[PDB]
Amino acid sequence: KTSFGSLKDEDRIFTNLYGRHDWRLKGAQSRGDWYKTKEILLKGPDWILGEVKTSGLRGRGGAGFPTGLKWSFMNKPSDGRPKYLVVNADEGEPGTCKDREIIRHDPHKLVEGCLVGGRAMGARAAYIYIRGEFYNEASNLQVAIREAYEAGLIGKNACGSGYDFDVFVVRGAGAYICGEETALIESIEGKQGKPRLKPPFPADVGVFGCPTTVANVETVAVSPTICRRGGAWFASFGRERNSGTKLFNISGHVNNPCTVEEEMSVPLKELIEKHAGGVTGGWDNLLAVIPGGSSTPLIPKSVCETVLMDFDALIQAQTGLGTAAVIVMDRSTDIVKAIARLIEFYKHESCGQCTPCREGVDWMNKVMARFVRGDARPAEIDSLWEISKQIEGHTICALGDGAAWPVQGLIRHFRPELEERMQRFAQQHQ
C-alpha cells in the first residue's frame, strides 16, 4: 500500500470508542472481547510475544519502542521474585485524552490486555496506575474488573487456563511526572513520583524491586486483538516500521475536536479535514499544528500539507509522533502565549529531582514570559536555544526533553515573529 488512511469500521480495534454501546461484560463479549482468551493463554508466552513482534506494534505511550522487543525482556527464568505488568493509565499530556476513552468505554479490552500481556511476560498481577483525576473512569474500570473476576476471567484459574493473574488499580494523585514509567513505579511504591535512573531498566528492577513492564493502555488493549486477528493483520496497516492503527485526539482550532481511531500513516491534513471538520476559518487559516501533544515540536502550515502521521515521517519532519494528539492552532493565535503557557505547564509538572529541569525549565518559563511581552532582545533567542540544548539530553527522564522541544520548535519556525514582538516592545516603550 502507498497511500494510507480511510480505515474501515470492520478493521477497528476500539469499537465502542464513543460510549455508544454497553461497556460492561455482556456488551464487551458481544463485540469480540474475551473470545477464545483461554486459547490465547494456553499457547505459551513465546507464541504471544511472537504475535506481538510480528505485528510491528510500537509503544503507544509516545516513545514508540517496539512492544514485542520490550515485552520479551521478561521472557527469562524466575529468580524468586514475582513479575509484574504495570499499565500506564496516567495520560497527563496536553492534547491527549485517548486512554480516558479506552478506560471509560472499553475497559474489558484493557483487562483482557492485562491478562494476555501478563501471560506473555509471565507476570503475576496487573497494577493499572490510573490518573487520580480520572475518578469516574477508575470506578468504571473497577466495575469491569469485578465483572471479570465474577465471570472467572481473571484471578484464580483465569479463563480456565490454570494461570493465576490479578488486576489492581492504583489511583494517582495529580502528577504528570507520574506517567513516566520509573516515576510511576516510585509512585506505586508510596513515594514521591521521581523518576529513577536507567539502568536498571524496570525489567531488571521495577515495581517493588521485581521484574516489571510498564506499558500504555493502548499498546496493552490492542494486544488481544493482535492475538485474535493475527499479527499480520495488524502489520498490514501503516508503513513499514509504522504498523497498525492509532487513536488520534484532534483538539484546538478545528471545527469538531474529537477522538478517532485511524490507520497509522494517515496524512495530517486528511485526518483534520475528514474527522474533525477542518481548521476553523479554512485550511488557509492554519498557523501551526503541535502533532503529538505538548512535548513534540510544532510544525507550520508548509509541513502540515504533506506530512504522514506516524513515527518516522514526523521524525523526518524534525518533530515527533508522541501520543498522536493533534493540537491545531489557527492564524488568530498568539503562538508565543501558547508555547509559554506550555512551558509554564512543564515547570508546574516537574518533580524537582535533577538540576537541568528543576532550574532550567523555570528559567525557560521566565524567558518565555518575557518573550510574550517582547521584554527582551534577539540575542536572548539563541541563548534560549542553548538553554534548551543544556536541558535536553542531560536530565534523568525525558520531561527535560519534552520541555526543551516546544521552545526549539517555536524558535526554529517562528524566530521572525519573536523578533518583531521584541522590536515593537522596544519601539513602543522607549
Binding site: 521474585r81 516510585e186 511504591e189 513515594k191 514521591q192 521521581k194 529513577r196 535512573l197 539502568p199 536498571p200 531488571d204 528492577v205 517493588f208 524491586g209 521485581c210 529531582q353
Partner: protein
C-alpha cells in the same frame, strides 16, 4: 582529592602567644611555617635523615573501593531500600 596527592613534611608546633600591644600571634619558632612537599614517602624520609631531623611517618590512608549499585536502592527483600529519593 588533589590535596592528598603528595607527601608533606611539617614540624611540631611550638608556642604561639599574644602580642601585648596588638593581640597578634607572636612566635619564636623559625620552623613554624615550614611545610615541605615530596613525591614519595622515601624522598621525605631521605630528606629528613639527611638534615638530622627526628621524624615520624604516617602511612598513606587510601579510601577502600566501595560497591555502588543504583538498583540496590530499590531492592525486593533487602534493607538497602531507600525510603525516599
Amino acid at each position: 582529592v588533589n590535596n592528598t596527592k603528595k607527601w608533606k613534611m611539617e614540624f611540631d608546633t611550638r608556642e604561639r602567644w599574644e602580642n601585648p600591644l596588638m593581640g597578634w600571634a607572636s612566635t619564636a619558632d623559625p620552623l613554624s611555617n615550614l611545610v615541605l612537599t615530596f613525591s614519595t614517602k622515601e624522598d621525605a624520609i631521605a630528606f629528613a635523615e639527611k638534615n638530622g631531623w627526628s621524624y615520624d611517618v604516617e602511612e598513606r590512608k587510601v579510601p577502600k573501593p566501595k560497591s555502588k549499585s543504583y538498583g540496590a536502592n530499590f531492592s525486593w527483600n533487602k534493607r538497602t531500600r531507600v525510603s525516599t529519593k
